[PDB]
Design a protein around this ligand. Structure first.
Ligand SMILES: Nc1ncnc2c1ncn2[C@@H]1O[C@H](CSCC[C@H](N)C(=O)O)[C@@H](O)[C@H]1O
Ligand code: NA
Lengths: 265, 265
């Protein structure tokens, strides 16, 4: 009578840890959701074939409203697994599902998996220099989210990098690209005019982390805003003050303009 | 002709990803480093047994000074693997190694794995709320470093959580405990008197992230500074103002006192 939260990783079914795989193979019932992120290199079949079980995919509503009615009941008499993209507790609200499990008298365990939050290390930017993170959300009707713009400003003033999770509407199969995120940011800059995000701002794009050939690009907005970074998922990063070696990496590995090697201390 | 940077995960030999294990097994040579961190829930022998390859351990100097004379030469005519605890490229000096690979005409690919950076999500604290990260270092001789205290100050001041890595002496296999870290911080608070870290400060301790039975504890320094958090390694987090959902998780899951539901929200 246990519930396992198991991350599947960044790109394909093999990004799962061996610990999670062996545990998943021996669970009675296996559930999962694919609305918190996109694993571009795999399919449900591949996942099912890898763990040797049929997986019941749950919708956001099934989880947020009926987790305790669909999943927990079974966990009271069996060993149940709940699979998610990346790490199950990073930039999701799944952590609260553990409280529900507790209230239903169900023991829960977390099996971590590679996450985009730590994968940013592949950009060459020192991971400890990242500040507050934010999400660039799609404007809805007359509602135009902008708080993520202030997060960048706040981190930039402190010389810290800003990681920007990009929006996702799984049901509409919509995955915000770094380009769309750059366009939204420019529109917010146009209205707020804080000199936070312009055509001359240096940004970094990481696409399909987890795959062997992710797209890692660094450069000025004016040049990257119309560039093709490949299929989603994407994340956008606005670096703060760069260390010489961060700039060297961005140039040598992310194809940034050599001139960023010239750091303004 | 190929060098693989492969993460070993958080705690034991099963924390590597299925993808990382397959690739490691197919490599001609396998190197590893255990100076940036250790795999406390396993041994070199168990890791070597799992991969079925002999693992040549490299020291900090081997890597930082001679990576190109020890690892890259073999990577020119074979498939080589470089294993590191956690997620590759997280340790600040590792990203530069890919530049060294490029300069040597060696292709490199990164195979991610869980990192404490994302695994701390198990504390219930929202990831986007973490600010700049830092390391608590042991004072030595006439050197009393305190920047990690200022980091906590700048983060907390902006409502952000501060992730604190604790000092480690890999070669001597000696870890700084959360208890020791708190003592130092109270000591630093006594000299700077900035009202950042006191007996009433709320803190979270995460130990053995990755294992199925990690220690997640939250409470005030006055009650935790002498509590036994078990075997290392320990991770210390000084949360900023909490969101009610975070506080509820720390209470129900991390045994935090209900007092935080009114005092720290
Ligand atoms: N492989 C990947 N490459 C690029 N961005 C990714 C990614 N996986 C997730 N993201 C980013 O994160 C968003 C989902 S947020 C949920 C993150 C997940 N729990 C994790 O641990 O990674 C996506 O919309 C995208 O912006
Ligand atoms: Na961070």
């Amino acid at each position: 009578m246990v519930l396992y939260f198991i991350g599947l990783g960044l790109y394909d079914e093999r990004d799962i840890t061996c610990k999670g795989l062996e545990i998943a193979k021996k669970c009675d019932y296996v559930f999962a959701e694919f609305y918190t992120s996109l694993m571009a290199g795999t399919t449900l079949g591949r996942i099912q074939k890898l763990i040797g079980k049929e997986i019941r995919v749950l919708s956001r509503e099934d989880v947020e409203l009926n987790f305790e009615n669909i999943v927990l009941p079974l966990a009271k008499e069996n060993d149940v697994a709940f699979l998610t993209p990346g790490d199950p507790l990073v930039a999701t609200t799944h952590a609260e599902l553990r409280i529900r499990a507790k209230r239903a008298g169900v023991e829960s365990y977390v099996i971590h998996a590679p996450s985009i939050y730590s994968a940013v290390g592949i950009t060459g930017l020192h991971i400890y220099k990242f500040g507050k993170s934010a999400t660039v959300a799609y404007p809805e009707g007359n509602w135009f989210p902008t708080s993520y713009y202030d997060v960048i400003k706040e981190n930039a003033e402190r010389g810290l990098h800003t990681l920007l999770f990009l929006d996702i509407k799984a049901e509409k199969r919509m995955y915000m690209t770094a380009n769309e995120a750059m366009e939204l940011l420019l529109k917010v800059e146009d209205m707020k005019k804080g000199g936070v995000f312009t055509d001359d701002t240096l940004v970094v794009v990481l696409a399909r982390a987890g795959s062997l050939n992710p797209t890692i690009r660094a450069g000025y907005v004016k040049d990257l805003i119309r560039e093709d970074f490949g299929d989603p998922p994407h994340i956008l990063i606005v670096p703060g003050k760069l260390h010489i070696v961060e700039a060297e990496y961005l140039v040598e590995i992310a194809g940034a303009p050599r001139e960023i090697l010239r750091v303004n201390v």
